Amino acid sequence: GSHSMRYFFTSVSRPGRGEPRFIAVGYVDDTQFVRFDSDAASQRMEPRAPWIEQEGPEYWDGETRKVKAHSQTHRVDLGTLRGYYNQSEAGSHTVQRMYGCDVGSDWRFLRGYHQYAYDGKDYIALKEDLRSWTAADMAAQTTKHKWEAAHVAEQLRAYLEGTCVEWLRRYLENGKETLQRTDAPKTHMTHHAVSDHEATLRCWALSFYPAEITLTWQRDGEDQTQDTELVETRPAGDGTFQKWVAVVVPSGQEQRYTCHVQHEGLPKPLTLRWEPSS
């Protein structure tokens, strides 16, 4: 199917003493594969997936240099934006950055992105053309004029269409045994009486990968949204994901209700019905 490579960066200023807290993570699809944490002892970019440990020491040296450079950029930006917004030196503030590329089922470039936030709100982002900038306010407009003058978008476009997609294809090949394996949802239904004449039916999807999934309830084959509840997809902690959906029904009427599961690992969508024995 389609695939993505993304890097996430967070820096949080510490006005009381010292440098910002900086955390960086890299993902292929929904799999974390590298991390850097300024509070950790190594002060190196570190592996988090077996297939990236293949890479030699020149890789780990280069990635460590680049991620520390990112951390200093964030440190400088925190100071610059505090000035733009006329904020006190006493408060803590946050900068966040995300960038990456998507490729299609043919592993060819589909789109790239590069976005920046200050205190949890959009600040500046590269447009989909990878040539111009969306500035959310007049402070960001100032940054936009500087980045136009310094050819910044050109360098980001070159990376997103070149290096980013080339190494993504390299990772997809080296980590083939997991990165190109789909794990279909293991599904089952549970039944919880809520009174002597109503019950909750809960439809479970467990141990699936990637995280994208749709769970929907139908009653006599029409969609059902009244009296349903859907939890956010959540990590199992072993690299796979979990989700459930529930509906409250009159006791005795369970056979009217069907749960429908769509996922990349399923040739055909699945249909589940309560089996009158538990």
Partner 1 sequence: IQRTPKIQVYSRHPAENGKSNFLNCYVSGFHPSDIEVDLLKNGERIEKVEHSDLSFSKDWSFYLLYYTEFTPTEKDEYACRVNHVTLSQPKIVKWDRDM
Contact residue for partner 1 among 8, 84, 109, 159 (CB under 8 A): 8
**With binding defined as CB under 8 A, does residue 190 bind partner 1?**
yes
- Asked if residues 95 and 116 have their Cβ atoms less than 8 Å apart, the reply is yes
Taking the complex as a whole, how short is the minimal distance between the CB of residue 17 and Na ion, in angstroms?
Answer: 6
Helices (H), 53-205: 57-84, 138-149, 152-161, 163-174, 176-179
* Phi (first) and psi of residue 270, to 5 degrees: -95, 150
Rounded Cα–Cα distance for residues 183 and 259 (Å): 19
**With binding defined as CB under 8 A, does residue 96 bind partner 1?**
yes
Pick the piece of the chain touching Na ion (CB under 5 A) from 15-23, 26-34, 39-47, 51-59: 15-23
Closest listed residue to residue 205, CA positions, set 180, 238, 240, 160: 240
**With binding defined as CB under 5 A, does residue 14 bind Na ion?**
yes
Contact residue for partner 1 among 114, 202, 205, 245 (CB under 8 A): 202
| Residue 151 is labelled as binding a ligand | yes
Contact residue for partner 1 among 98, 110, 152, 248 (CB under 8 A): 98
Helices (H) and strands (E) in the chain, counts: 5, 17
Rounded Cα–Cα distance for residues 135 and 142 (Å): 9
22-81 residues in contact with partner 1 (CB under 8 A) are 23, 25, 32, 35, 37
- Asked if residues 86 and 142 have their Cβ atoms less than 8 Å apart, the reply is no
Question: 191 pairs with which residues across the strands?
Answer: 201
Whichever of 64 and 94 has its CB closer to partner 1, that residue is 94
**With binding defined as CB under 8 A, does residue 119 bind partner 1?**
yes
Which one of Na ion, partner 1, none interacts with residue 73, CB within 5 to 8 A by kind? none
**With binding defined as CB under 5 A, does residue 18 bind Na ion?**
yes
**With binding defined as CB under 8 A, does residue 110 bind partner 1?**
no
State the helix-helix crossing angle for 138-149 and 57-84, rounded to 10 degrees: 130
Whichever of 18 and 276 has its CB closer to Na ion, that residue is 18
User: Cβ of 121: how many Cβ atoms within 10 Å?
Assistant: 9
Q: Which two tokens stand for residue 66?
A: 């680049």
Taking the complex as a whole, how short is the minimal distance between the CB of residue 23 and partner 1, in angstroms?
Answer: 5
| Residue 264 is labelled as binding a ligand | no
Q: Is 116 exposed, middle or buried (0-12, 13-18, 19+ CB in 10 A)?
A: buried
Contact set with Na ion (CB under 5 A): 14, 18
Query: Residues annotated in the binding site for Zn(2+), as ranges?
Result: 151, 154
Contact set with partner 1 (CB under 8 A): 8, 10, 12, 23, 25, 32, 35, 37, 92, 94, 96, 98, 117, 119-122, 190, 192, 202, 206, 231-232, 234-238, 242, 244
Query: Residues annotated in the binding site, as ranges?
Result: 151, 154
